[PDB]
Amino acid sequence: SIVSSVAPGKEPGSLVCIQAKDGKVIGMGARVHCGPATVLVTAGHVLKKGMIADLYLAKYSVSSKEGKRVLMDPTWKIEYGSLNKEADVISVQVPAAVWSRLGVTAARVRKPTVKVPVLAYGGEASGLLQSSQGFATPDGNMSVAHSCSTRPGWAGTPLYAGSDIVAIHRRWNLATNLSIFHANC
């Protein structure tokens, strides 16, 4: 798996970091279309931390030439998924105002295909992102096997196939086949 630096602002427009209050990146996520609206999608064990501590959605701002972030409200409604279950995927009805302030566009969820090329993103700061290349294969249940290298703090990051998201990375590999749970939309 080839690992590469991603220049500030050149990551996909849907991607967001999830930070603790001291700025540490503890997970990733993305804005995706969900019926007539959009949702955050991330790992359930990442979102669970925001029940007892403050988490922030974070993304590099091209116009400000620095990172920006917005406090997460744990009472934002859950669209699908769960904080504690095996698939470890959850989606949240984040207000459009928050996505607007961070510059986050919505991506499309697509079904994975066999050995589809994929990119996964993560990093220690919103202008210090990196990507890892790999391939993804769905298992006929709710998961995808994939070959992207990841680091701790990449939990919840999408696997991108071209423009679209086909999976959610779980933990530092088996990702969740997002289209399975996205059918709740």
- Is the Cα torsion angle 133, 60, 90, 98 positive or negative in sign? negative
- Closest by CA to 176, choosing from 142, 148, 153, is 142
Instruction: State which approach was used to obtain the coordinates.
Output: X-ray
Resolution (A): 1.6
Q: Which amino acid is at 58?
A: A
Neighbours of 149 (CB within 10 A): 16
The rounded distance, in Å, linking the Cα atoms of 54 and 65 is 25
Q: Could you give the C-alpha distances from 165 to 10, 39, 110, in angstroms and in order? A: 16, 13, 6
The rounded distance, in Å, linking the Cα atoms of 176 and 169 is 7
Q: Is 181 within 8 Å of 109 (Cβ atoms)?
A: no
Q: Is 176 within 8 Å of 168 (Cβ atoms)?
A: yes
The rounded distance, in Å, linking the Cα atoms of 57 and 53 is 13
- Closest by CA to 58, choosing from 42, 34, 45, is 42
DSSP string, the chain: --EEE--TT-S-TTEEEEEETTS-EEEEEEEEEETTEEEEEEEHHHHHGGGTS-EEEEEEETTTTEEEEEEPPTTSPEEEE-SSSTT-EEEE---HHHHHHHTPPPBPB----TTEEEEEEEESSTTSEEEEEEEEEE-SSSEEEE-----TT-TTPEEEETTEEEEE-----EEEEHHHHHTT-
